[PDB]
Ligand binder design. Structure first.
Ligand SMILES: C[C@@H]1O[C@@H](O[C@@H]2[C@@H](O[C@H]3O[C@H](CO)[C@H](O)[C@H](O)[C@H]3O)[C@@H](O)[C@@H](CO)O[C@@H]2O)[C@@H](O)[C@H](O)[C@@H]1O
Ligand SMILES: OC[C@H]1O[C@H](O)[C@H](O)[C@@H](O)[C@H]1O
Ligand SMILES: OC[C@H]1O[C@H](O)[C@H](O)[C@@H](O)[C@H]1O
Ligand SMILES: C[C@@H]1O[C@@H](O)[C@@H](O)[C@H](O)[C@@H]1O
Lengths: 309, 309
């Protein structure tokens, strides 16, 4: 009606980024998810550009941490007292679950902890792991703990950054038992309930399943479950945030098109609250052409019947 | 008449990503560039969406490598035989300087080298550094070397990834002497000329300088020069690539606007070949409101005289 036309990006899946970890998308996946709660906090955005949960705009400020560190005596463990992106003091009273970009799964995330000494520009970097299921993982309260490879190299009161790389598993344990991508951390610790969460999502329509945007997280030790599914590519979050096109119905019908044939491969529902469903029953890795893309076709209701995927 | 209208993203500087390394933008910087050649290969795209140099679309597939590795006896060094993003064979004959996303500066980039064994899903990760100025750095040929913290953990003929984190310097030598952000690597090795390059850029009007989109790379050891300037944010590259709006003239005039006050702070030229200039003389860190953004106003040409910044 003159309303700003809704669109999705024309970037292909492999040209886009996982919204839950700073790695490329690899593929589309669908499977049943009735048995458990799907309530990721990263990669959550309405089609009209309202960021939800812990979602922020940067594809490379996901699962990062910044602040000051203090050594835990008799250990190679450091407590990081969190700062903001701009390196200011952290504010815990904001009505968010945790700082934006905080990890939204229970797992042992490995990367590098790096630091610069302001006075002379000296620098240092150490392999480090943050276990988001641990008692000291209290990002909402302004603190997390890292296990590192040093007992003395990090300085106090100097800007320190964690850059995530991948995940680990304890190899004396049954394989692929962690990370648990669908388990939220307890952002304030084990005795305090999470707050201000983006809602859980599920298909409601018979024969429908969620369509996931899937990556494989690098594994850094042990026998981890490396699958990582997001609801929206990070580029879609950035696109909707900018466009802010109002939803004209509950569902934006998308067609996934193959340029090499000119034909539609499948269609799907992009729910205005920011998730996708397809008509399929079972676990399936979608096979798509490298140049295939999503195209918005029309606003439909929640109860539209999709052609089977 | 009838050209698709040109636009730039409304994302703020701080909401965008460096196109030369997987870190957020921090600030805008201008300075004289007569003392160097500004010929980065990442973050190069025309306003009409033609990717140049080694530029690709993923903000998280910049300064990464994938392939499989071979140990060099007597050392902690491994040679990686490069694969593509989707783990396929690398083609050295494609008319590009190097694989898309290859580092475009001489420096020592530190990160983690990770691996998965296909048969059992066992994984491993080690701190690793790639010396992009060294003789073994031959990405165009399909081979690069990493120095690591292990002499025996990595397996042969298993998919291996390098994830970049930051840069290092040798602390026994002159501080901030490396990395050298404006020195291109020799993509095929010592004394072999590079091919298929994106061109050097410079201001071509009196009283103009390049406008750079600047970040600070993490430092991981020693006393590195952490400054990193790109010509275009990664989001701008993604935007132009998708939009493909025809360049109506040589220069798109942009205004940088403060929505808090409603006033234009400065104007600048976005050259159709994908770089920005401003009217200023001297090194200057721009001070901008966090909410400030760029807006396309009109097509002009290279003879247009800017208002002083
Ligand atoms: C499954 C196994 O995981 C990794 O080994 C770790 C051990 O890691 C430590 O030793 C290994 C070399 O043996 C390596 O140097 C690693 O960086 C270092 O932390 C250790 O954490 C044990 C303790 O539970 O778990 C695993 O065995 C990996 O390095 C191995 O190659 C292999 O994939
Ligand atoms: O100068 C101290 C420094 O020496 C080097 C090591 O890699 C660091 O862990 C640190 O101990
Ligand atoms: O000369 C090498 C030396 O460089 C710095 O001093 C580092 O802190 C040390 O860990 C060591 O690597
Ligand atoms: C210059 C040195 O570089 C290395 C670091 O491990 C040290 O902390 C120091 O910064």
């Amino acid at each position: 009606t003159g309303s700003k036309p809704f669109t999705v990006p024309i970037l292909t899946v492999e040209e886009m980024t996982n919204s839950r970890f700073p790695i490329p998308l690899e593929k589309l996946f669908t499977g049943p998810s009735g048995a458990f709660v799907v309530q990721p906090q990263n990669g959550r955005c309405t089609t009209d550009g309202v960021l939800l949960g812990t979602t922020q705009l940067s594809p490379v400020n996901i699962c990062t941490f910044r602040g000051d560190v203090t050594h835990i005596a008799g250990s190679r463990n450091y407590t990081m007292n969190l700062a903001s992106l701009n390196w200011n003091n952290y504010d815990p009273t904001e009505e968010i679950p945790a700082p934006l970009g905080t990890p939204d799964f229970v797992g042992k995330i490995q990367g590098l902890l790096t630091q610069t000494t302001k006075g002379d520009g000296s620098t240092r970097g150490h392999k480090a792991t943050v276990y988001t299921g641990s008692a000291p993982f209290t990002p909402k309260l302004g603190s997390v703990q890292f296990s590192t490879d040093t007992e003395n190299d990090f300085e106090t009161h100097q800007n320190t950054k964690f850059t995530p790389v991948g995940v680990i598993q304890d190899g004396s344990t049954t394989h692929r038992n962690e990370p648990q991508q669908w388990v939220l951390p307890s952002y304030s610790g084990r005795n305090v309930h999470n707050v201000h969460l983006a809602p859980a999502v599920a298909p409601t329509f018979p024969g429908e399943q969620l369509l996931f945007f899937r990556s494989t997280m690098p594994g850094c030790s042990g026998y981890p479950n490396m699958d990582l599914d997001c609801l929206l590519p990070q580029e879609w979050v950035q696109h909707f945030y900018q466009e802010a096109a109002p939803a004209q119905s509950d569902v934006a019908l998308l067609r996934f098109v193959n340029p090499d044939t000119g034909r539609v491969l499948f269609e799907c529902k992009l729910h205005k609250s920011g998730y996708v469903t397809v008509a399929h029953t079972g676990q399936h890795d979608l096979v798509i052409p490298p140049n295939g893309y999503f195209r918005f076709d029309s606003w439909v209701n929640q109860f539209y019947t999709l052609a089977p995927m």
